[PDB]
Design a binder for these strands. Structure first.
Lengths: 151, 262, 205
RNA sequence: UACCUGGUUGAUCCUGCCAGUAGCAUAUGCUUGUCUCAAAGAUUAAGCCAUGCAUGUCUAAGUACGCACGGCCGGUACAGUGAAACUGCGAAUGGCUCAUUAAAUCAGUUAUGGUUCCUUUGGUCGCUCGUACUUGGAUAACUGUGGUAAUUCUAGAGCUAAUACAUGCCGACGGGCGCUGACCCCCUUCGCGGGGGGGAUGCGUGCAUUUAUCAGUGGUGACUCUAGAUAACCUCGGGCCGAUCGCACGCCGGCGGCGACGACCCAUUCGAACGUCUGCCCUAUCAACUUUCGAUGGUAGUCGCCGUGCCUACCAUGGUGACCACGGGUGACGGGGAAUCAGGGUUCGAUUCCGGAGAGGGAGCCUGAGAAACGGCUACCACAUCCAAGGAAGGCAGCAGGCGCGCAAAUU
RNA sequence: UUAAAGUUGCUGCAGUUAAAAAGCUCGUAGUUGGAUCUCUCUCGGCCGAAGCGUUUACUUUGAAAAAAUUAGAGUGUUCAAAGCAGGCCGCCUGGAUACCGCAGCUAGGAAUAAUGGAAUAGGACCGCGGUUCUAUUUUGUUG
RNA sequence: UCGCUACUACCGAUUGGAUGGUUUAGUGAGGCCCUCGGAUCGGCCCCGCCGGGGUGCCCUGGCGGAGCGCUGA
């Protein structure tokens, strides 16, 4: 199974899949009810999370994470390691002896959910703060906006 | 530090206590209690420093252990007890009742009340929840847990508590057009009517308040205490009535006083 | 001793840190309780705030739930099979959370037979016992037999579950951490999860 | 007060430095009448320490058979004061110092919806359907016999208590609510049958624990929240459901009013602990660094108070860097702040306030709510003390004081 | 050690001959870059609650920012450095106020500076039709 | 250039010495956890001397002995 590529069976803990109802229910269709939440700060849940079948517990809409803290924005730089991406934030720092600025940047690793498909490394992503998900990951992608070369 | 602290240095004490530099190295650290350390007035700084009934800290203990002071109807023999906003202090020997109310400068005032007014206090609502077997529970700014309240009372409201029984007699909701006092920040001690409340989800709300003279200011929603319904307060007010005078107006009002003398 | 600090590692860039304080007590770790199979042995541990944990060192029985029927019972754990974390934890017969173990079936076989009034798990050799027949074929009143007969319409179990009931042992997943709460509770495997777990047991042989 | 002057030439005008000039901090020299405030062994040696002191504690209210006391009354179990000792609490605060430490510490800003919390304040404390008008065994103080050169070392024997250590009920208790349910009644059909009721007999039940399933009181920006229902569970190294104490004395043998001490839990106060965003000196004669020995991430678990490569197994090959990574140096604890000052700026901040760190150097623990504690213990390394040579005992970067080091700092 | 030092020069220095422009050109990062364009749909009793206008930088405002120190108000310590006291014949009265880069939060402005909005038209706005999932109002209730 | 005086920095055979910091391999005190172990200390049993009550039997009290008894620390 594509959904079952790991050594342990993957399921949404809130969902019970063994409701013995009737032979007709077996005959009719086997599609699990899915748990999705409304991560809400004006954000909308993508429809690929309500209709998807992926199993990932660090997703905000269909996983066990809470979004609180800071809302930030960045530009996608690298998509290489499994299920997480590296983004860049560019800012100006003020040096007051010369009354001038200098460009500085930060590289920040965020978690990317499967509900956000067809994303390339040029585009603006909004991120929300959550609990520590790994050693160097504390943010999670909440919205994807295409870059200047929008099709 | 390997544990909790038990001392307070005099320069680190809350400024509204009005403690001088050269009396000692230490200040009374308030005991743990219903009010916060930085938002309370300990009993020693009220009996000795404000009312001058005692000259030293040993005399405050002699007044307290005679069981003369009642804080909201109960005798407290602790001399660093954290009394706070809206509390009622009763000295039966001299027949005095006081209410802890901020003045316009942000300091607790010596506000004497009548024996009838000392029978109740106004309490903000901090938390509402449901406990075992579906019993509603309140938690106030005074750390009072009051169960089976009215279902119309919500967070940020004000209730009236009869100090003899500890039960709710009335309440005021939070809405525009209601009187309030500021209990923190830069507008501490100011009294005015709520005009607007702008909501910032995921962050702190902001409430706009207008005085009786037409001056408008804003505060965080956690620094607002609803006093009365409309323009009429539910408790007696200090001398300044919550209006903040400018330094020029205060200077003119002070100079006019000494000319009157003669 | 065993510590769980973050300052002995490397920085994100790959640089070596220099610690500024020594080991504290809010950072400690303790040896693992490798819960084996046997008569119960539990040791209490005093933990932060003055509370206590229960290190189970041996376990023999546990609370397990037949979820489809909603039937939770005490049952004697028998054997340890495929483990999703380490396949070394099965040779030593170690109980941990989310482990695949074998449990007895008789408490479930009694409830099914006393509720649906049907024989489940009986082999095709005509095994009849007077106590069993009094359980099964006792004569009830009109209304009681009507209420039992309207119930037999949906008294059907899958083919993978009924095979296990032939050998007297079911396959279960422990949903509790036995080395922290001192007990091994869980649920019996069913459906596609049982289908998944029956493949990787055979794939280890 | 937005300032200059001397010095290169036979003489001139420049560049340019040297010297002069004023404050400010350390040391030092000479001099010194009155009075107010007032820093003071930081710099170098976080080097070493003789001696004394710096942490103890009882109310009416845990335990009094010391005549140790003047004194009641004499059958009064205990009149009172009260050493000792058991029990409880504190000793994790304060005081000192600045060695370590370069996104580390720390500052402003946020979050715990990811944790714990002695105590104070408030709630809760007949919600459980199963000897009590009082339960058991000891052991201190005390008496007596001792051992050792030696310590705040302790052995044996004879007593005796508990809010120490254990055990264990009555009562509200009559029931109620869920399953099992032989038997009984009514309506309808000619009947079989169908429908609606009553029920004896049994098994469970409250709050905290653990697992699973179900439906949708109150609230959030958002719960896998709170409250609810169902099937079970519930650790002997064990979970709550009061065998405790004082003062006034009473109403009709029963009922009782004020307190004190304890109690699982909830909330609150004092916090603590982890994370979020921005910010630090010099150095390229440091340009690539990390990953065998976890480096970045995924899955499942162990451990932890909890969130996390915190650790393990199996996978993937990631992660940072001229916008200066990695390495090195710092007479580097960080801020609030101090000196100087036209405006911009330069330098200092060991130092009484806030945060951090340490107790000769490493490491490991016990008790406890809280410590990897040092005026606690256990080892090793370096020093060092008494000795009958068998052994025993150590930690001034606490207050004085001494030695040493120095240009450099006060009273046992 | 600070000023003097416009002898470290952002304000604000020098490079023909006094110290000094690379032998020359290409070229990535960095720095800099020519004109140009004049607020509204639902609700609660004519206003508010809710959407943004492409996004910013900038500017003004608001609240949030430990005390001590510094600036500063009052006050004859006998004056002053200080202190937070004091004054009238039991009363009266203070213990103000300002400042607190950068970053984070908030609300007005829209010049200057970046940025996007239709060119295989997969364009805007209007009415029209079809395919699929689906709202659980209505059949006094229940299927 | 050659001759005379003083002081600094450098090269240098001697695989220099002193002081301190890193590591390979091996050994490894002490605490903590797990599995054993069992010097001692009771209780419930069994007999022997025996009082009371209830009715040869049981509840009891002072005990002594002994049994590869069981159970606890």
């Amino acid at each position: 199974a594509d959904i079952q590529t790991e050594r342990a069976y993957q399921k949404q803990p809130t969902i019970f899949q063994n409701k013995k109802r009737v032979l007709l229910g077996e005959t009719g269709k086997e599609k699990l009810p899915r748990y999705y939440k409304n991560i809400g700060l004006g954000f909308k849940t993508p429809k690929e999370a309500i209709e998807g079948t992926y199993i990932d517990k660090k997703c905000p809409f269909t996983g066990n994470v809470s979004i609180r803290g800071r809302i930030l924005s960045g530009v996608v730089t690298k998509m290489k390691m499994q299920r997480t991406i590296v983004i860049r934030r560019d800012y100006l720092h003020y040096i007051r002896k010369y009354n001038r600025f200098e460009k500085r940047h930060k590289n920040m690793s965020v978690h990317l959910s499967p509900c956000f498909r067809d994303v390339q490394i040029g585009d603006i992503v909004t991120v929300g703060e959550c609990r520590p998900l790994s050693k160097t990951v504390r943010f999670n992608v909440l919205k994807v906006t295409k870059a200047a070369g929008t099709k | 530090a390997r544990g909790p602290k038990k001392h307070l240095k005099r320069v680190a004490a809350p400024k509204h206590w009005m403690l001088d530099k050269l009396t000692g190295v230490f200040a009374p650290r308030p005991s743990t209690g219903p009010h916060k350390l930085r938002e309370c007035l300990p009993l020693i700084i009220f009996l000795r420093n404000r009312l001058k009934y005692a000259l030293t800290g040993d005399e405050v203990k002699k007044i307290c252990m005679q069981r003369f002071i009642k804080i909201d109807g109960k005798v407290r023999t602790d001399i660093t007890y954290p009394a706070g906003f809206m509390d009622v202090i009763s000295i039966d020997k001299t027949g005095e009742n006081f209410r802890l109310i901020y003045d316009t400068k942000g300091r607790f005032a010596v506000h004497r009340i009548t024996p009838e007014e000392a029978k109740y206090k106004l309490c903000k609502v901090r938390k509402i929840f449901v406990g075992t077997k579906g019993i509603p529970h309140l938690v106030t700014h005074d750390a009072r847990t009051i169960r089976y309240p009215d279902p119309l009372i919500k967070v940020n409201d004000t209730i009236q508590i009869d100090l003899e029984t500890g039960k709710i007699t009335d309440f005021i909701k939070f809405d525009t057009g209601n009187l309030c006092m500021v209990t923190g920040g830069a507008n501490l001690g100011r009294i005015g009517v709520i005009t607007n409340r702008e909501r910032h989800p995921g962050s702190f709300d902001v409430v706009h308040v207008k005085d009786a003279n037409g001056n408008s200011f804003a505060t965080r929603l956690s620094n607002i205490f609803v006093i009365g319904k409309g323009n009429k307060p539910w408790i007696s007010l200090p001398r300044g009535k919550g209006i903040r005078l400018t330094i020029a107006e205060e200077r003119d009002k002070r100079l006019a006083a000494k000319q009157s003398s003669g | 001793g065993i510590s769980r600090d973050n300052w002995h590692k490397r920085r994100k860039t790959g640089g070596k840190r220099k610690p500024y304080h020594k080991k504290r007590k809010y950072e400690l770790g303790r040896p693992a309780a490798n819960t084996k199979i046997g008569p119960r042995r539990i040791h209490t541990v005093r933990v932060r705030g003055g509370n206590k944990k229960y290190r189970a060192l041996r376990l023999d029985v546990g609370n397990f739930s037949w979820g489809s029927e909603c039937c939770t019972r005490k049952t004697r754990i028998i054997d340890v099979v495929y483990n999703a974390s380490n396949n070394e934890l099965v040779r030593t017969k170690t109980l941990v959370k989310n482990c695949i173990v074998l449990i007895d079936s008789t408490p479930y076989r009694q409830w099914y037979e006393s509720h649906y009034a049907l024989p489940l798990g009986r082999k095709k050799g005509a095994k009849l016992t007077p106590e069993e027949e009094e359980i099964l074929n006792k004569k009830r009143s009109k209304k009681i037999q009507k209420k039992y007969d309207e119930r037999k319409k949906n008294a059907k179990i899958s083919s993978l579950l009924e095979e296990q009931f032939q050998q007297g042992k079911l396959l279960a997943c422990i949903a509790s951490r036995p080395g922290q709460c001192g007990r091994a509770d869980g649920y019996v495997l069913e459906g596609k999860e049982l289908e998944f777990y029956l493949r990787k047991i055979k794939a280890r042989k």
